[model samples]
Target: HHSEGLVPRGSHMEAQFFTDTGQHRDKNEDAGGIFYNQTNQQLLVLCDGMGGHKAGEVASKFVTDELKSRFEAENLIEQHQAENWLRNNIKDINFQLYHYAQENAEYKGMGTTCVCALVFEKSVVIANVGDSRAYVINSRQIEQITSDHSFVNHLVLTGQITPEEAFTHPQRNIITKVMGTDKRVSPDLFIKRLNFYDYLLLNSDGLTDYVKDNEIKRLLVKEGTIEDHGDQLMQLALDNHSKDNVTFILAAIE
Candidate 1:
């Protein structure tokens, strides 16, 4: 944990947030949040839930509510403190949801994917479970910061299939890992140094299933603020006939 001088002050960054229920989905199973401390330090989160009979919505709501509430009240003085807070709380969330499913037969097997970023003035820390993603976009190229915990992703990683094949694979949505589905939960952690022109994005699988990385980079690099960039990205996804619930947050560091 790199905790030295962790204070984030001044106008190092600002963000834009958006969530939409797309054309096909009857109801949105996605949730997103952006919270700011006194110094304008921001914590962003997104979750895409899956299950039955509105349980998907319940799972995502539980995660977003618990996470935002805890992060707001917790005193995080170091990087490790923040990391521990995220991991421990995620575990607690898993337990709560899993226990609920155990007691209620109707809601059994419900779960959600989570991706969150805690932003400081000089750096950022990211944590994720499931297929929700975090990305860093610069002038030259776009980079993915989180790996998907889905079955298809594992196949691609092991050279069992090409990335293109994984995209169209029938089991693409079959996530290998998730919160609230099982007793054990493992989340990926990332630490990155911010730059003046860097743009960080947290998104659900909704956007990625349709928009290619090159298209995302092209839209982000356009001359504008983060707000319009997010709007434009959503529009492109919808135009491309992306049927999933769309949600994302874009942060521009300056």
Candidate 2:
């Protein structure tokens, strides 16, 4: 673990992007983004698309592009400011998607899940609209920063189902909230201060579905370097026979 107040600035940030056809499906529907803005040091976004082949990819790419363009053009001075920007942008994306589908029936019901983080000198701001997750790991302790917006999680939260049971539930993939699914969408937002050696892990359900948080913490703590550990984590998910597409991004505060 890094000592207090030693956050690394301009530290090397490296990422690996991969997707497999998986064991069950002929096509992969998931898409992701890994973005870092050195000029502002204030924005990063990840989007996971879910829908039919063409629609899913389009939705994911559109949401990501919208966020990137807005961040580059807008002035986000504070963490809350960034969150509000994203909230508004999500609504815009939803509208564009809905209108597009209405105009072009071929893309009907197209949508994507978004999870974004704004890195500041003192804290990190996080927001999400679907099952994609954000986690922080420090000295082998892992804390999930976003909750799944799926039927299983809803059941767990309402005391109708146990956490373990939700994992194996039949309707696990039914997301309750997602972009373009509704006229207006609400995203969960959070703010956290980072300590030195704190590592951020953001991934699609492909990784979380097959691997538990404790397992991830164990690997991250032992791997020593973020690059090797990140690659191994993806490999671990594949080796465990995950049936869905997998993608992940790891960032560390030095």
Candidate 3:
């Protein structure tokens, strides 16, 4: 793992991110960001990139950058605009990444799993492609809001294996869908209204593959600063032997 501090990516809005280059990876292919517009609209993005020679990082970084720029320039104060805003931006970004990869041989076959959440005062609109996940947490429970697009998840769906087995399956990392690899992308959109004191957690597989859902909830509710919670989450992943780049964006709805 890298020796960098677990820095909070944002100071306001009760939102922050912590990322680490894991024990085995030479570099952190995970990328994410938290952004807000003048109207107080918030965007939380996380991606786990896949490919060789830093191409994965390129794909993830490109997607986040594009989304950040678009969100910053637009006024999405109306709740009705949430779906269209997410769908249109992701579709257009997927198109650019696909074509760009096709034109550049060195970056061919690069792709990423993405989860983006548009946070409002009372609700969140989440868009996902591939296996990175969005979880909604409260005092009593934690629920996974995004379904994974992975080979192992497909097996669980077909009843060939239990959800428990999929976690340890040999091909757990083989994702069935991804961004920047196909010309057309189909993203899943979900909308959920938040109660006071609820939290939204957007994270890469690095965190999920190792950290249990219950553990996540327990630690998040532990008594400490948000930074301390973030560090605890990161530490849990490392202690659990996460060999992939670990990353997550945690947001609280007050």
Highest-lDDT candidate: 3
Q: By the TM-score metric, which is better: model 2 or model 3?
A: 3
lDDT of 2 by residue, 1-254 (tens): 22334333432334345455567655566665555553545565666778442477677777878777767775434444666766777778878876775667777788888888777766777889999998988775799989999989989999999989988988888888888767788899888777654678888888898999988888888846776887788889988888877777787776
Better of 2 and 3 by lDDT: 3
Choose 1 or 3, whichever is better by lDDT: 3
Q: Rate the local accuracy (lDDT) of all candidates.
A: 0.82, 0.75, 0.86
Q: What is the C-alpha RMSD of each candidate to the true structure, in Å?
A: 2.2, 4.9, 7.9
Residue range 104-199, candidate 3, lDDT tens digits: 998887888789988765678899999999998888989998999999999999999998899899999888889898889989999987774567
Worst 10 residues of 3 by lDDT: 2-11
Residue pairs in collision within model 3: none
TM-score of each: 0.92, 0.87, 0.92
